[PDB]
Amino acid sequence: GKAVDGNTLVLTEEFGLVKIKELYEKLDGKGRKTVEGNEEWTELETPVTVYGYRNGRIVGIKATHIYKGISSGMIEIRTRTGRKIKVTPIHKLFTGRVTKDGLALEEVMAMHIKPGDRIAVVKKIDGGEYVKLTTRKIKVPEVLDEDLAEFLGYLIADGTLKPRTVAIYNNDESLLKRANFLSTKLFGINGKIVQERTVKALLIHSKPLVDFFRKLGIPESKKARNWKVPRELLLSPPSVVKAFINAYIVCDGYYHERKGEIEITTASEEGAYGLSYLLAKLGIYATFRKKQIKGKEYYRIAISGKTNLEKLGIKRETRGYTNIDIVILFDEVVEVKYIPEPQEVYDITTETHNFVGGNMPTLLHN
């Protein structure tokens, strides 16, 4: 059938950005299940909200069924932006061609895709509401607002969790003082700025505060390689996402003045992919590259061009708000790989017959 590889990420409201195989395993049997030969599916008792294309926007839509099957082979497609999707050969992709007279859209089976073709990718994801967070003493924020998203950006970029201490490592004391101010405003407690052997740090000693961030999904070990974007951020308004993104960039961003691009490099591959979804909530299209640096693999997210970059600014021309985005772009295929080995594949049935997935946001078809 038409299906995708199990490692394909899918954006969901309930679980955040999750591999479709893990979504399947979580929901397998929660509804009316049918097994027919090598195929199986569950009609979900309650649909799961994913994202899809409806009336010119990418919005939350209902997925009613989850499906697991087998395919004899697969097609793996890589694009110029660094998207890489692995799908069954009959999986339908939406392409765009630049012609004599203009732009032509048609559906094309993955097996017929060639380098030079351009597939539909998502530039802008709609939605987002202030997320309610369910509850010595601290105050626990009740909403994920811009202040908490900014603090989360410092913590995810440059911070660690230990059982008794929330730490931020950064040589810019003004940044540490801003994080400390946010700690006082948000949690009612503050920390101390310390000179450590390698870097300055702000240390906040509070087991309840650590527990707060643990509950948000910040890892306590192997954080550099394993952090993920919290599902609460992926459900947040664009202004909250932007506070997080700008805080991250302040910590780790570089600007190439001649390429005109902001670059961040992370050791977390799934973290990098989550950042691309957060950027799409802002209407920013990013590029992704793996880089081998000093004998290790890192993950580079880049933001290029005045249209992208101006959306990060705190001061913006007022039309930037009235100019409503175009939501879909067409991304050039650079490599196609034909994979004869059979494997399990997965699908989700939605009311639009499409959904948003891939390592960076891509329009996929049922």
Numbering used by the authors: -1 to 133, 141 to 371
Give me lines lifted from the publication on this model.
Inteins catalyze their removal from a host protein through protein splicing. The HINT domain catalyzes the protein splicing reaction, whereas HEN domains often function independently of the HINT domain. In this study, we elucidated crystal structures of HEN-associated archaeal inteins inserted at the same insertion site (VMA-b), which is located within the A subunit P-loop of the vascular-type ATP synthase (VMA) from Thermococcus litoralis (Tli) and Pyrococcus horikoshii (Pho). The two three-dimensional structures highlighted a modular architecture consisting of HINT, HEN, and an accessory domain (ACD).
To investigate the structural and functional roles of ACDs in HEN-associated inteins, we decided to delete the ACD region from the TliVMA intein based on the three-dimensional structure. We could also validate our deletion design by determining the crystal structure of the deletion variant, termed TliVMAΔACD intein. The crystal structure of TliVMAΔACD intein confirmed that the deletion of the ACD did not influence the HINT and HEN domain folds, nor their relative orientation toward each other. In the DNA cleavage and binding assays, TliVMAΔACD intein similarly cleaved the same substrate as the wild-type TliVMA intein did, albeit with reduced DNA-binding. To our surprise, the deletion of the ACD from the TliVMA intein changed the cleavage profile. The substrate cleavage profile by TliVMAΔACD intein resembled that of the PhoVMAAct intein, producing two main products as opposed to three products generated by TliVMA intein. The DNA sequencing chromatogram of the smaller cleavage product generated by TliVMAΔACD supported that TliVMAΔACD intein did not cleave the alternative site as observed for the wild-type TliVMA intein, similar to the digestion pattern of the PhoVMAAct intein. The DNA substrate containing only the alternative cleavage (AS) site (intein coding sequence remained inserted into the homing site) indicated that only TliVMA intein bearing the ACD was capable of digesting the DNA substrate, whereas TliVMAΔACD intein was not. These results revealed that the TliVMA intein cleaved the alternative site (AS) independent of the homing site (HS) but depended on the presence of the ACD domain. Furthermore, similar to our model DNA substrate, deletion of the ACD in TliVMA intein indeed reduced cleavage of λ-phage DNA, supporting our hypothesis that the ACD renders the intein endonuclease more promiscuous.
